[PDB]
Amino acid sequence: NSNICEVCNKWGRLFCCDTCPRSFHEHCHIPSVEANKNPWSCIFCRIKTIQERCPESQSGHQESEVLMRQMLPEEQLKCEFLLLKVYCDSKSCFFASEPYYNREGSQGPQKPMWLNKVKTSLNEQMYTRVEGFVQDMRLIFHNHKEFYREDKFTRLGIQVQDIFEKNFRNIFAIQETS
Numbered sequence: 001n002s003n004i005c006e007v008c009n010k011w012g013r014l015f016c017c018d019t020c021p022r023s024f025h026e027h028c029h030i031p032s033v034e035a036n037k038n039p040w041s042c043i044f045c046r047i048k049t050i051q052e053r054c055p056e057s058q059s060g061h062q063e064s065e066v067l068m069r070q071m072l073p074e075e076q077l078k079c080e081f082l083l084l085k086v087y088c089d090s091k092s093c094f095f096a097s098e099p100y101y102n103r104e105g106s107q108g109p110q111k112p113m114w115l116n117k118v119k120t121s122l123n124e125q126m127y128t129r130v131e132g133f134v135q136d137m138r139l140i141f142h143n144h145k146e147f148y149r150e151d152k153f154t155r156l157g158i159q160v161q162d163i164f165e166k167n168f169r170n171i172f173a174i175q176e177t178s
C-alpha cells in the first residue's frame with residue numbers, strides 16, 4: 001500500500017485499502033473509514049465496482065437528468081466521491097472551513113457555504129436529490145467569485161470549480177460536448 005494519504009498526501013495514522021494500494025487518514029476518506037470491516041474497500045474501489053456491475057452506466061447522460069436523481073445509496077456514494085475528489089486538490093484548503101467576509105468595497109454572500117458544511121450535510125443525509133449537493137458545491141465557488149471581484153484571488157475559485165466540474169462530468173458520465 002501507499003505510505004501517504006491519497007487525499008492530503010501526508011503520512012500519519014493510515015488505513016489501507018484491501019483491494020487497491022491507496023491509503024487514508026480516517027477523516028480524509030469519505031465516508032470516514034469504517035470501524036470494523038475486514039476486508040475494507042475504499043471509495044475508489046466501491047465506485048469502480050458500480051461501474052463494472054453496470055457497464056452501461058458509463059454511457060453519456062444529460063446533466064438535467066442527473067440532477068433530478070434521488071439520493072439512493074449509489075448516488076449518495078457518487079456525491080461522497082466527488083466531494084473527496086475536491087478535497088484531493090490542495091487548493092481546497094481555501095474552501096474547507098467556514099469563511100468570513102470583511103473587505104472594503106464588498107459585502108459577504110447571503111448564503112455562505114463551505115466544504116465541511118457539505119460534508120456534514122452528506123453525512124446527515126440532508127440532500128434528497130443530487131441537485132441539492134451540486135447546488136451547494138457550485139455556490140461555494142460562485143460566492144467566492146462575487147466577493148473577491150477583481151482581486152486575483154478570485155482565480156482560486158475558478159481553479160477549484162474546474163476540479164469539481166471535471167470530476168462531476170466523469171463520475172456521473174455526463175455526455176461529452178463542444
Ligand SMILES: [Zn+2]
Pocket residue numbers: 005006007008009010024025028
Ligand atoms: Zn489525509
Ligand SMILES: [Zn+2]
Pocket residue numbers: 017018019020021022041042043044045
Ligand atoms: Zn481501494
Ligand SMILES: [Zn+2]
Pocket residue numbers: 053054055056
Ligand atoms: Zn447493468
